[PDB]
Amino acid sequence: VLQDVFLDWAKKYGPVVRVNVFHKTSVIVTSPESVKKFLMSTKYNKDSKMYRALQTVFGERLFGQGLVSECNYERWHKQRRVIDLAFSRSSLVSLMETFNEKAEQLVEILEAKADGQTPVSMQDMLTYTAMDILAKAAFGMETSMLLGAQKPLSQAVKLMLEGITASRNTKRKQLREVRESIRFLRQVGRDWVQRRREALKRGEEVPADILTQILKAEEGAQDDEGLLDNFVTFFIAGHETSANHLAFTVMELSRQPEIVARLQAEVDEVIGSKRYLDFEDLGRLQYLSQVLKESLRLYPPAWGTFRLLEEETLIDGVRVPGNTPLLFSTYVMGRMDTYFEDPLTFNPDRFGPGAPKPRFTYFPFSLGHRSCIGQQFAQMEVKVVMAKLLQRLEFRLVPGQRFGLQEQATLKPLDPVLCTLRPR
Ligand code: HEM
Numbered sequence: 235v236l237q238d239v240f241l242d243w244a245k246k247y248g249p250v251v252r253v254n255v256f257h258k259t260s261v262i263v264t265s266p267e268s269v270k271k272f273l274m275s276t277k278y279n280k281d282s283k284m285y286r287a288l289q290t291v292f293g294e295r296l297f298g299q300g301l302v303s304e305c306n307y308e309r310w311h312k313q314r315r316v317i318d319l320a321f322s323r324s325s326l327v328s329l330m331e332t333f334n335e336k337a338e339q340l341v342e343i344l345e346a347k348a349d350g351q352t353p354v355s356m357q358d359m360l361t362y363t364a365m366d367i368l369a370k371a372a373f374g375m376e377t378s379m380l381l382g383a384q385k386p387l388s389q390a391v392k393l394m395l396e397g398i399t400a401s402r403n404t405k406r407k408q409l410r411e412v413r414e415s416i417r418f419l420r421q422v423g424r425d426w427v428q429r430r431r432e433a434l435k436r437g438e439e440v441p442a443d444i445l446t447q448i449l450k451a452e453e454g455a456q457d458d459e460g461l462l463d464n465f466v467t468f469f470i471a472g473h474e475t476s477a478n479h480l481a482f483t484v485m486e487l488s489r490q491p492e493i494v495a496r497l498q499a500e501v502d503e504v505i506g507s508k509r510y511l512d513f514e515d516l517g518r519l520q521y522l523s524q525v526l527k528e529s530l531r532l533y534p535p536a537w538g539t540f541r542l543l544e545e546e547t548l549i550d551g552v553r554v555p556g557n558t559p560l561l562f563s564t565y566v567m568g569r570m571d572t573y574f575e576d577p578l579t580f581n582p583d584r585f586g587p588g589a590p591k592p593r594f595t596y597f598p599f600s601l602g603h604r605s606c607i608g609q610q611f612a613q614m615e616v617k618v619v620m621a622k623l624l625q626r627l628e629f630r631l632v633p634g635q636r637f638g639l640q641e642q643a644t645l646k647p648l649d650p651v652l653c654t655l656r657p658r
């Protein structure tokens with residue numbers, strides 16, 4: 235696991251280490267002061283050299299210059315500020331219904347299989363859930379993957395992500411499948427763009443959402459390619475990392491009984507057996523909140539980010555040449571005993587009330603101007619999903635399932651988190 239190699243080198247060779255990552259020289263930077271310096275200033279910006287890979291894959295245009303992959307400050311600032319509107323307090327509150335609907339549906343589907351003997355992939359289940367939530371919430375569309383629909387669409391996402399991996403970590407069947415899948419994704423967008431426009435044209439009233447803001451950001455452009463870049467971007471960013479995080483959380487909890495009991499007790503105190511979770515109910519799921527923060531420390535789906543160091547600089551008593559991609563890793567810093575006591579122990583008490591917040595040693599949603607636009611969105615959906623599962627279902631990992639990670643485009647469980655389930 236590449237990230238675990240970086241961890242070793244970080245601990246042995248100190249806070250500034252030259253590496254080869256995605257075929258390039260970069261320098262991994264692991265002091266909290268360096269994380270603060272570079273990530274908390276609009277001065278430093280993403281390295282296009284590292285983000286080019288994501289713009290186009292095997293010749294086929296993918297995320298282009300969408301909100302994630304755009305590295306020029308001014309160009310990203312113009313899109314971020316218009317798209318920010320789709321993430322206001324009251325926009326996210328408007329999504330609680332989607333969040334509750336999909337969560338409820340997931341649980342019933344699992345409840346129908348809850349005999350203690352039917353192996354279910356919590357990875358796939360959680361993936362379908364996040365995708366269904368994203369599609370409705372952001373785009374006003376219903377994929378219904380939870381109901382077995384859109385099998386080709388999920389096949390297409392699967393091959394695209396395998397494609398990302400292959401293309402940046404060092405086969406002709408795959409190559410066509412992958413190009414095919416990326417085109418499929420972009421066509422799905424072209425479609426859902428027509429659908430929206432066609433509703434507006436006949437003068438229907440469409441509640442403001444994410445799609446609204448990315449059309450709006452594209453107003454005054456000769457074509458729709460920037461629009462689709464952004465459609466594919468949110469399509470993927472808005473579900474894959476949430477699903478990874480949900481899958482890791484469930485995987486870890488299966489060997490954490492004391493913690494689950496306490497999670498069950500909390501759910502029982504603040505919501506009991508209530509069916510629909512209001513906004514104000516999430517705020518009070520304090521212990522669940524800690525478990526989730528702790529899941530992200532050990533298992534961040536998005537392990538880090540790159541900033542371009544434009545000029546030779548002294549970082550932690552090491553001269554670093556100009557034009558150097560700086561690598562930051564919350565995965566690495568999360569596992570260093572110098573920042574976290576007993577780093578390998580899953581202990582949600584680290585995030586308890588009273589405990590000093592981690593000081594630039596923990597950034598699962600990144601930091602500063604290029605941090606995750608979807609943070610609050612994600613935190614809400616996973617709480618809703620996790621709370622529902624904690625109310626109703628008990629999980630048991632299938633013997634011979636592993637607890638390890640694989641680095642694909644993001645960090646995800648090695649094994650698909652196969653479980654048998656039981657009503658609570
Ligand atoms: C547990 C879930 C999630 C995690 C851990 C996560 C993590 C991250 C991180 C680390 C970044 C910075 C990436 C980089 O520097 O290359 C990022 C960016 C981004 N994520 Fe998330 N994210 C998650 C969920 C979401 C959701 C739910 C959405 C959409 C609703 C979303 C949309 C975005 C977008 C558009 C950006 C680019 C932001 C910008 O640079 O202005 N993500 N995410």
Ligand SMILES: Clc1ccccc1C(c1ccccc1)(c1ccccc1)n1ccnc1
Nearest residue numbers: 288297302303467470471474475536643644
């Ligand atoms: Cl390319 C990808 C696939 C699946 C999930 C996330 C990403 C992505 C990313 C960012 C930096 C380095 C590798 C992958 C991503 C990059 C560009 C466009 C969309 C998603 N991402 C991480 C967090 N949010 C989005």
